[PDB]
């Protein structure tokens, strides 16, 4: 939640949601362990991107990541990555 | 009106962006640690003094013998900037299906004798796959349950 | 057991070339005409303090002084530091030495384990500026001829930056190590200390500290410091 | 000596102006690239100001 | 049943002196042209040139009376380079007044007239500006490089001053001239 702010870093702020530095608005957040847990494997987020986002840009593309120098195609093999992984939500976990 | 008027400025712009630095010449002993002929257990430890050692991390990644890399504190592209003090490495032996069980806050099979850790110890993983030297009398290793 | 320095003991404070420049610096220096202790070993190695720097000078005939033990507690509990020259090379190893009450060399002594790292590199006067700032350990030195009886001279020569070390310990006290022929185990060199001063260094054509002015020596040297010139 | 004082006063004023570029005025550095290589421009902006 | 083994890399930082990290690889050095440079951390912009200065082997760079860096040592070939700034100056427009004409001439202070179409970005300009960057009306004054005026050998009174004895005016088609001024 600290990454939803102007000029913050982290993989939510570099790869998913980039607020501009000259932002005018509000950011509102609340704990939702009532409904969003039980795990759940459709709340995803991106781990890999070849360059950072600009302010207010989204991206949907399941291109496998060139993380090995030699290329791979279509199939995740060696040093090939599907960029969307999930959150493991379970109500036994501590807050954070 | 008639006169002379100072209106603008001009400036010649640069063309290149050259980089000069000393010779990368203090190489590190990367050869007698993981290309050696004797390895350890969780029973036995080697605490090594990795210092006065400025050598690369790319062949630790871009070679064809180490399998898995997922790493939170740094991206493999910029290994050049971040420079670490008190570098420590210790060798072990773990069976096959215990890959994904050393992680920040991990409760798998081996959390109590392979020292479960939060993300105080940030760093990547290196996964060499032996296929010939481990194969066939080499029961020298130790473990407690 | 006390003499003065005259102008002895100024060093190069940074790695910047200058020429025909008077420059004003604010570093740890040895003040001009100060009180330096005198230890002669003729018939004497105590556990002297390291406050925020030490000047050392020791002239010889036949190479008796070897090196220096630094550290904090001197009890084989805290990290200690060491330098020994052998007429082969130099060794600077940062072990946790088991210590004795007379650590000379014989005509030798090493109880070193749990170490950190290591490095290998009359007509005499041999000067040394030790310093431990920001987790570093610097050494400045020069050796030079003499023409006198026994005293420190009144010439001018500036000391070069020999070797900086990545140590990172806490340091409080030190002790020298010089040898003697017979081994007596019980179960000649000056020392001045550095203070924060302000100096005015003169650089010549090829760039060498040729003169200096201590800006707190006397009221005439304060006028040279204000006008930034050597003549008033 | 009256002509020499005009040359000396003008040359001293220009040396004071160039030596004022080594002051940080309360910022963490007086070099403008070192602020732009150790901070991000939310609060690197307030150090350049 | 595979002898698996991964090693995690070390703990926290800003902690001690010399560290353990990767290489800092170098580009080849190029001279006589305005470049961005990085010599061991010291960053600037300027023109490099082999110097007739030689200094002591522990010194890395040089400074002058106002603490400006004006020499540097290459950390591989221990050579002493000079540093001079890239060319800058003012741009001044000479007009006879809009209620008389609309033709102008341009002075570029402290350049040669061959260095002008790269000092200004003439290919990145309006074609009506590329008139005043090259041509046949080119004169080298001590005030700079005058472009757009005809250098004659007469002498008149000063009308629009330029500097170091040179003036300009609107004279008879009609054009703008540049002459040494007459004292009487
Ligand atoms: C320095 O040595 C002189 C020797 O004449 C002595 O009188 C004096 O007390 C000493 N100390 C100081 C601070 O001058
Ligand atoms: C400085 O160097 C020049 C040429 O190397 C030499 O002629 C001169 O004697 C040197 N020493 C000075 C100026 O003290
Ligand atoms: C650095 O390596 C180059 C090899 O191209 C050599 O020419 C140069 O002398 C070296 N510099 C040193 C060792 O300081
Ligand atoms: C310029 O001249 C015209 C006629 O030639 C006149 O009407 C106009 O007022 C003049 N402009 C000014 C600003 O006086
Ligand atoms: C202009 O060009 C001439 C070439 O004849 C050169 O000698 C001179 O130094 C140049 N003047 C400058 C660059 O100011
Ligand atoms: C001025 O005299 C010089 C002498 O070389 C001549 O070349 C030049 O063309 C003359 N210019 C004019 C316009 O009279």
From Swiss-Prot, chain E:
Disulphide-bonded residues:
34-86, 113-145, 158-167
Sugar attachment sites are: 99, 112, 153, 172
* Outcome of mutating residue 66 to D: In strain: Alpha/B.1.1.7
The consequence of residue 1 to H is: In strain: Omicron/BA.1, Omicron/BA.2, Omicron/BA.2.12.1, Omicron/BA.2.75, Omicron/BA.4, Omicron/BA.5, Omicron/BQ.1.1, Omicron/XBB.1.5, Omicron/EG.5.1
- The ranges of region (Disordered) come to 15-37, 117-136
Outcome after substituting residue 151 to Y: In strain: Gamma/P.1, 19B/501T, 19B/501Y, Omicron/BA.1, Omicron/BA.2, Omicron/BA.2.12.1, Omicron/BA.2.75, Omicron/BA.4, Omicron/BA.5, Omicron/BQ.1.1, Omicron/XBB.1.5, Omicron/EG.5.1
Q: Which domain of life is it from?
A: Viruses
The free-text function statement in the UniProt record for this protein reads: Attaches the virion to the cell membrane by interacting with host receptor, initiating the infection. The major receptor is host ACE2. When S2/S2' has been cleaved, binding to the receptor triggers direct fusion at the cell membrane. When S2/S2' has not been cleaved, binding to the receptor results in internalization of the virus by endocytosis using host TFRC and GRM2 and leading to fusion of the virion membrane with the host endosomal membrane. Alternatively, may use NRP1/NRP2 and integrin as entry receptors.
Listed under subunit, the entry gives: Binds to host ACE2. RBD also interacts with the N-linked glycan on 'Asn-90' of ACE2. Cleavage of S generates a polybasic C-terminal sequence on S1 that binds to host Neuropilin-1 (NRP1) and Neuropilin-2 (NRP2) receptors. Interacts with host integrin alpha-5/beta-1 (ITGA5:ITGB1) and with ACE2 in complex with integrin alpha-5/beta-1 (ITGA5:ITGB1). May interact via cytoplasmic c-terminus with M protein. May interact (via N-terminus) with host bilirubin and biliverdin, thereby preventing antibody binding to the SARS-CoV-2 spike NTD via an allosteric mechanism.
Could you tell me what this protein is called? Spike protein S1
Q: Whose protein is this, by species?
A: Severe acute respiratory syndrome coronavirus 2
């Amino acid at each position: 939640v600290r990454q939803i702010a102007p000029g913050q870093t982290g993989k939510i702020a570099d790869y998913n949601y980039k607020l501009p530095d000259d932002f005018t608005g509000c950011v509102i957040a609340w704990n939702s362990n009532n409904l969003d847990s039980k795990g759940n494997y459709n709340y995803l987020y991106r781990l890999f991107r070849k360059s950072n986002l600009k302010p207010f840009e989204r991206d949907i593309s399941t291109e496998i990541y060139q993380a090995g120098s030699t290329p791979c195609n279509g199939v995740e093999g060696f040093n090939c990555y599907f960029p969307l992984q999930s959150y493991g939500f379970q109500p036994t976990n501590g807050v954070g | 009106e008639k006169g002379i008027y100072q209106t603008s400025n001009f400036r010649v712009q640069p063309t290149e962006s050259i980089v000069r630095f000393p010779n990368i010449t203090n190489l590190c002993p990367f050869g007698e640690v993981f290309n050696a002929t004797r390895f350890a257990s969780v029973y036995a430890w080697n605490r090594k003094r990795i210092s006065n050692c400025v050598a690369d991390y790319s062949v630790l990644y871009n070679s064809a013998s180490f399998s898995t890399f997922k790493c939170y504190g740094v991206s493999p592209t910029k290994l050049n900037d971040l420079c670490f003090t008190n570098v420590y490495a210790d060798s072990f032996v773990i069976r096959g299906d215990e890959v994904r069980q050393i992680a920040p806050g991990q409760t798998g099979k081996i959390a109590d004798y392979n020292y479960k850790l939060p993300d105080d110890f940030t760093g990547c993983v290196i996964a060499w796959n032996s296929n010939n030297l481990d194969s066939k009398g080499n029961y020298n290793y130790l473990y407690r349950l | 057991a006390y003499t003065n320095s005259f102008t002895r003991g100024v060093y190069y404070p940074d790695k910047v070339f200058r020429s025909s420049v008077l420059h004003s610096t604010q570093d740890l220096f040895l003040p001009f005409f100060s009180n330096v202790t005198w230890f002669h070993a003729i018939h004497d190695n105590p556990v002297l303090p390291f406050n925020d720097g030490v000047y050392f000078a020791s002239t010889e005939k036949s190479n008796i002084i070897r090196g220096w033990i630094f550290g904090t507690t001197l009890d084989s509990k805290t990290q200690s530091l060491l330098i020994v020259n052998n007429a082969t090379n130099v060794v600077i190893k940062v072990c946790e030495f088991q210590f004795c009450n007379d650590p000379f060399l014989g005509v030798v002594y090493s109880s070193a384990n749990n170490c950190t790292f290591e490095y290998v590199s009359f007509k005499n006067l041999r000067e040394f500026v030790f310093k431990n700032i920001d987790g570093y350990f610097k050494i400045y030195s020069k050796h030079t001829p003499i023409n006198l009886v026994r005293d420190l001279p009144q010439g001018f020569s500036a000391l070069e930056p020999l070797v900086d070390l990545p140590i990172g310990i806490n340091i409080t006290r030190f002790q020298t190590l010089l040898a003697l022929h017979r081994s007596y185990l019980t179960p000649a060199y000056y020392v001045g200390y550095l203070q924060p001063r302000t100096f005015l260094l003169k650089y010549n054509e090829n760039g060498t500290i040729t003169d200096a002015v201590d800006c707190a020596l006397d009221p005439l040297s304060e006028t040279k410091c204000t006008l930034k010139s050597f003549t008033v | 000596g009256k002509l020499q004082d005009v040359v000396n006063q003008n040359a001293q004023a220009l040396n004071t102006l160039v030596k004022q570029l080594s002051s940080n005025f309360g910022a963490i550095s007086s070099v403008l690239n070192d602020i732009l290589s150790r901070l991000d421009p939310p609060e690197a902006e307030v150090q350049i100001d | 049943y595979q002898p698996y083994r991964v090693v995690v890399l070390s703990f926290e930082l800003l902690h001690a002196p010399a560290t353990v990290c990767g290489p800092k690889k170098s580009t080849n050095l190029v001279k006589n042209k305005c470049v961005n440079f990085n010599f061991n951390g010291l960053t600037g912009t300027g023109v490099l040139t082999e110097s007739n200065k030689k200094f002591l082997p522990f010194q890395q760079f040089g400074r002058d009376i106002a603490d400006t860096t004006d020499a540097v040592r290459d950390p591989q070939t221990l050579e002493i380079l000079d540093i001079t700034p890239c060319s800058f100056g003012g741009v001044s427009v000479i007009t006879p007044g809009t209620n008389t004409s609309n033709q102008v001439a341009v002075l570029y202070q402290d350049v040669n007239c061959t260095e002008v179409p790269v000092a200004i970005h003439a290919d990145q300009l309006t074609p009506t500006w590329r008139v005043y960057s090259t041509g046949s009306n080119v004169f080298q004054t001590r005030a700079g490089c005058l472009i757009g005026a005809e250098h004659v050998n007469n002498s008149y009174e000063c009308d629009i001053p330029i500097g170091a004895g040179i003036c300009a005016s609107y004279q008879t088609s009609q054009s703008i001239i540049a002459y040494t001024m007459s004292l009487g």
